[PDB]
Amino acid sequence: IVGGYTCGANTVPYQVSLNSGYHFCGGSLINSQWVVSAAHCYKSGIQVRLGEDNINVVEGNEQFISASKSIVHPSYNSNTLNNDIMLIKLKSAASLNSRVASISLPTSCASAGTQCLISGWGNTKSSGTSYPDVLKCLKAPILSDSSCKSAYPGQITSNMFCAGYLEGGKDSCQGDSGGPVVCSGKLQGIVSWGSGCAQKNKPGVYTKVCNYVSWIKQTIASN
Numbered sequence: 001i002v003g004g005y006t007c008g009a010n011t012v013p014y015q016v017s018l019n020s021g022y023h024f025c026g027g028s029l030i031n032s033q034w035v036v037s038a039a040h041c042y043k044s045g046i047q048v049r050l051g052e053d054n055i056n057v058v059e060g061n062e063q064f065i066s067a068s069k070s071i072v073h074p075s076y077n078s079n080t081l082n083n084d085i086m087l088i089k090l091k092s093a094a095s096l097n098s099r100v101a102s103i104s105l106p107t108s109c110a111s112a113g114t115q116c117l118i119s120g121w122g123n124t125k126s127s128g129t130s131y132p133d134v135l136k137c138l139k140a141p142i143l144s145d146s147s148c149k150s151a152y153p154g155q156i157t158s159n160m161f162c163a164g165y166l167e168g169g170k171d172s173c174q175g176d177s178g179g180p181v182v183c184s185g186k187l188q189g190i191v192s193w194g195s196g197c198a199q200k201n202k203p204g205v206y207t208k209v210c211n212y213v214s215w216i217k218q219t220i221a222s223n
């Protein structure tokens, strides 16, 4: 997260870190045995880490659970990143409390102007790599579709939305991929891509979760 602030230990209880010997992506806990992340974060050997703040220190509240299976959306396209969403089932259920909790799925899509919270342990520099130890947060608005399409002409599908600041300076970045975009207490987006990080006129692009709620529900229901 570039231009963000320190969230504070466990203030974002649904945030998870996907780890394969190091943190490579974020994710959101939607129920005690399922996490939602981005399809481009897929790999084998994933350990889901819940209740984290400082990812390099065990401080208490952490639950490390291995992934039992990862379900990348069948229509995921790695070239366009359309349908960039993945579900991970946990080997055992997590213990939920106030430090580890699930986030609700939306009932409706959000509208431009809605203010959301984006979090993660991704890079904090737009020009260079600086990865933090603790979780960073950023409050950003969802942009209108015209502004999004005008910034990324021909690359935005109906399963994507832009959120951020056209003036540059504040944005999500690599290491944040797979994590949450929560608005009014509902998971509305998944950190997916962008051109560089925090560049002017190049907002972040997120997977539009409201378009996948029935898919998520049906898939969990059958696995």
Ligand SMILES: *[O-]C1=C(C2=[C][C]=[C][C]=[C]2)[C]=C(O[C])[C]=C1C1=[C]C2=[C]C(C([N])=[N+])=[C][C]=C2[N]1
Binding pocket: 024, 025, 040, 041, 042, 171, 172, 173, 174, 175, 176, 177, 191, 192, 193, 194, 195, 196, 197, 198, 203, 204, 205
């Ligand atoms: O997400 C990501 C990855 C990545 C690939 C495969 C597994 C995990 C992570 C790699 C990468 O370097 C090639 C860059 C990203 C990445 C860039 C970026 C930018 C923005 C933005 N500008 N808002 C958001 C998210 C990401 N992810």
Ligand SMILES: [Ca+2]
Binding pocket: 052, 053, 054, 055, 056, 057, 058, 059, 062
């Ligand atoms: Ca820790």
Ligand SMILES: [Cl-]
Binding pocket: 149, 153, 154, 155
């Ligand atoms: Cl277009």
